[model samples]
Target: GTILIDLSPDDKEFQSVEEEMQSTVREHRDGGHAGGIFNRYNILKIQKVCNKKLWERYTHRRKEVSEENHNHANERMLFHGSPFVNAIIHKGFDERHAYIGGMFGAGIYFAENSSKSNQYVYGIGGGTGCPVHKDRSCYICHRQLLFCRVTLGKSFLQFSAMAHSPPGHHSVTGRPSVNGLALAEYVIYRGEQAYPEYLITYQIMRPE
Candidate 1:
């Protein structure tokens, strides 16, 4: 719950270099805008992915949690962030540049310890294609977390962090899926009011 979103999307004021480009061809090239949809729909498509939670415990789970723990709790709350909506498209074009126009399909991140420390988030989201540097696993957990926001609106704004990857079966750079799972889990943690909970939840595609 540290990041804030402005009504207007101006990278200049926000200090974000992210570019916003909307065009039919642009969307099409990026999975053809959901296998050939339009740009407007693609925006909604990306939003749904960035706006909701898409985590399945049945197929993926670690031993740390009991069956109940994996199932998720109702007391948890959530927020979502997406610095880039079409990162997949951008990655394909930029040779995996440092996060460019429409680079992420969908993304989410956490804002833990932001206020007390007076910090701001500055990083790009990743997919399975991540480089996997020294800190591959999240200190909070060996894996990713569901993003959650402790506050909302202004003066304790609730915002989500979005990451990026590529547009193929596998992640272009690192592991978008891994980040996705991690970020979503962070959100659920925040709903529980955990002090260091995540602050975002997002995806490229909504769960059917």
Candidate 2:
């Protein structure tokens, strides 16, 4: 089972994580409209994930891989947005349910740019009827995104979509393209390779 701990606005860790997301979004907004129309986002709430089992597994894997070569684990804080945040928080990331025909592969996808992740977010309320969390009170409008810790032990640079990682590679990274992807995307084949560290609920604001 997963435990969700609400983060206080005054918490230092919360402030730092919030700022990191804001800055990433800001950079994407200023970089030019590549992925989609740049919209400002206001983070509403953040929940810290406390799944002892998952964390232990993730740390064990990290240690095993790290001890072999004395190399950095290459863990990254990436963004993953979806309407299934409720299930994801409880059951963890399952690649079997991940969207197929993804640019990288049929694996768990993550992004460096929040905008890319935002594109996949499902808006709740504001006319789009709430489906997942009907028991909770409705909001004016909000979307959920996961700030995850992914261990890319040895990522293979992929120029095209692949069903499996190259030999000896633990993950796949989509190549950057000027006319296509503005930021890199990381894909891990296994759910244990990534941990859903934070769940962020945010609202979008479009410029007039």
Candidate 3:
């Protein structure tokens, strides 16, 4: 599992073809965030756009290639752990939304353990195969180093941890959802730990 940081929804592209992604927990894979609008007809274009931005700013391979056999599949998760959001956060009719159902692990890269000491921030020179692009990758060339630097007094919300859950499971009264979806949030270097930062609330239409 990798940490996925959503780009700001305020971007001009968001206003364009990717508009439906707003206010929803999106899935980021292959270097970009995807709108799970189920065969929305034009979503491919949006994915291309988003992927382009990701590669432009976060990839070492800057050139474009045929997307015909694209193999960049990654996993992202969102949790609806807050009752405050439980009623308000969106869920598709099938209730396929942000809920933690399967086995998962939670933690950030900063903390070596749950003890909250010797926190860190590291950078990588190449693709993590599943690392957070926002973690560190220069847009210039994506050439970074295994630079484990140090710092202090700065607080951040990290999602460097992961869990296991398969897509295509649904039941309002089952493993992951009581009403619709389950959520968990947690803060790094602090006791406020349960879920990652909420960038947005989203609805993913289960594919037909």
Candidate 4:
């Protein structure tokens, strides 16, 4: 994904050319939102984080990278699905606090289907090997493009905050504690909306 909105000094030289991912919040991937807490916990915390010694050590290595073996290991599905959140909305989940699972997304990126008559206040744009940083890129929460080029109304509503700790280990004072649970929501999703102007999105496939 080619985001840098305007900086061009080779972008801080990527923390001096990958000095082991500069404190390692992750980049080319290794487990941030999904498989975090020593490998994820989906299907409702996967029988208690894999009750078999954590599934012989972590969900049998990502359950074979599904979708029928990921184009046979050519591997490309960090998270992908859009048409502005599949044309309307379905990407749900807001049970925050130490969110560590296969990181959300059975669906997302919709802006015109599901019989709501063009619902949702926003759609996709965050990085996927650069289709122009994918989907018009620029809206973490109504951040311009004339308000992402209109359509949403009533003083607005949109979603997407993404976590696995905000900046470094859940910043807002890093309150980590999964299986023991200890979250302090300084910021996450914000609230209000299973309806009304209808724009809801939660990590769509980073959907923790």
Candidate 5:
């Protein structure tokens, strides 16, 4: 129901960015090139935890949810945003020292408006090792969304706003998953030229 990522109404700057990303994609896509994967400007990976309806329910019941059932509820599907992905593309990164590298993992949790700072999201691998600050929760949740354009191809940017279960676990057998089981949405951009265009797609990730 919700447009996970907004692609319509392309901004002038975003159009320019897509144009460059397209050229890079062409370099790797046209007639096969020396380097199979050339994601100099943007690199990415994605996984679909479950179906659309299932994910919707997870987010719908985020509140009134307890810690005991948190993991069990997380077993369901819920796509989220990427943080560093936001850093490279948007001004949001300006506020934080920021990490620039591979994403060990990512996930999301819910903190009801009436709730206090009770949830935690730790950063691993190339991401910030510190837990997400309660004050920054809003930003963390906002970053769950990802944007893409055809020019960038599939090798675009990716980010998980809150938490991630790590590499080696799926809904059926995963633990300490994205807290609160928030829903993840994707966005794509396709412009008349390079001005701007949007398209979104999700991939179901493996336990390992």
Candidate 6:
């Protein structure tokens, strides 16, 4: 039902994503004045996700929203960090599984800055129950990040925490540090509005 196409490190797609991740982390650290110096991680693997059914659903939703808004779909590729990478890739995003009381609401959350998403990345011990890597390693920690295509047809710029999307708006957008947020965030209530496109596995590299 789901397919993952491996990408070599030298591949243009892979290189571009890797570069984006590194640069965003650098920018966030330097611009945000985020306390002490923290080094970025090295990407271990990047994979292209292919799901025909999921694509069809996302495109259908995008087209409907576009027609209703009488404009472009305004789709953007964003980042979503989660521990349940395998579950998300297999079943797509489920808001029911999302964290409760998010700054923007209970919807699925995404970020344009990769560093913003990286903060949410956490590892599972042993690696046996790892989402991306299903091996029985004795001591291994694996983390994952998802690059998703979000159809933000008509988003309402939110300045404070809310429980739901504003009337007639397809999504919610929050500016960096606005209302105490660290970085920009986008939230879409409907699961079909997002399509997980790429998955990245990485490990943090601390300064020596």
TM-score of each: 0.19, 0.80, 0.18, 0.16, 0.18, 0.81
Candidate 6 residue runs with Cα over 4 Å from true position: 26-37, 123-140, 160-164, 178-183
The global C-alpha lDDT for each of the candidates, from Candidate 1 onward, is 0.23, 0.72, 0.23, 0.20, 0.24, 0.73
Give per-residue CA lDDT, model 4, range 126-165, as digits (tens): 2232233332222222211100111111111222223322
Q: Sort by TM-score, best first.
A: 6, 2, 1, 5, 3, 4
Model 4's alpha-carbon lDDT is 0.20
Q: What's the lDDT for residue 56 in model 6? A: 93
Off by over 4 Å in 3: 1-12, 16-22, 25-72, 75-103, 108-175, 181-208
Q: Count the backbone clashes (under 3 Å) in each candidate.
A: 46, 0, 18, 22, 25, 0
RMSD of candidate 5 to true structure, Å: 20.0
Name the regions of candidate 4 deviating beyond 4 angstroms. 1-86, 89-130, 133-193, 199-208
Give per-model CA RMSD: 19.3, 5.2, 20.2, 22.3, 20.0, 5.6
lDDT of 6 by residue, 1-208 (tens): 9999999998999998888777666344334232113457668899999999988989999999899798789899898876667888988877654656677768888887776675555431222333355432212454678988999989998765324568888988987643343556899888889999999987655546
lDDT of the structure predicted as candidate 3: 0.23
lDDT digits (tens) for residues 68-183 of candidate 5? 34333232212112334323232211223122222332322211110110111123211332234333222222222222211111212234442222223221112223433322
Residue by residue across 93-140, what tens digits does model 1's lDDT show?
A: 112322233323232223222110111111232222212432212222
